[PDB]
Amino acid sequence: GSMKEEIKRLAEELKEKTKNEEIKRLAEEAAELAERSDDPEVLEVVKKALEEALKSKNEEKIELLLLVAVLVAEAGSVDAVEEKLEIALLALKLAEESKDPRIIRGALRAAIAALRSDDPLALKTVKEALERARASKDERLIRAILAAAYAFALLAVAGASAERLKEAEAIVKELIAAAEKGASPQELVLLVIEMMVKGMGVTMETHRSGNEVKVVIKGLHESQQEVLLEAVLFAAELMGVRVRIRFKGDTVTIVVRE
């Protein structure tokens, strides 16, 4: 009721204060989701998150607060899907018990993307990835699990077919298994690239020099290049890997530096 109009005003103040477009988008959907929610406990959380976001200037913490508001408003009350509430709780518990902000960002992003996909394969993959991350305290392993879970959920949100999503699932297993063996973060980023390539049905060429590992992806169009870039850049930021991006027409060139 009264909180919904206050949430819209608080979300408007954040949009005008900051210039980060991702913060402005998160503030937008936080106001949209809150207006469609009648639960008072949901509205008080997203308003409490928006108020603390206005008390801060650090864009990394404002994004995290906004991600909590989006996830809770997406599935944080009764009359929501029981499986969506489980995934929301797993990401919130994993984020509360972690120190690295990239683990907090990855856990919330992966959960939000899985709920919006409405795909049963994406819901179970992210659910099992969050439980696997909670079972260990290896922050380096947790960051690789969340990067793979988020990129896989993006494929479902983007509308990947069941056949291509299944091939992408086999790479999710391979990436997680390779992270538990201590594989370098560069090879884990290369696996994210391969996951998105098979998930969208295109091809890739890998030219390995040992120093400049370059991947050339052909046949991608506008929406596909945005989804691929969002998944790979998110993984690189969580793994601490420097990546160079170049696109031209329907081709995307990705260089993974150590």
Next chain:
Amino acid sequence: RKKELAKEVIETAKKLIEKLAKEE
């Protein structure tokens, strides 16, 4: 169960927000 799951979501989210609020 949905009521109990929703309660844990609100409780955990409130603690996560105060956690991000204290740390800078």
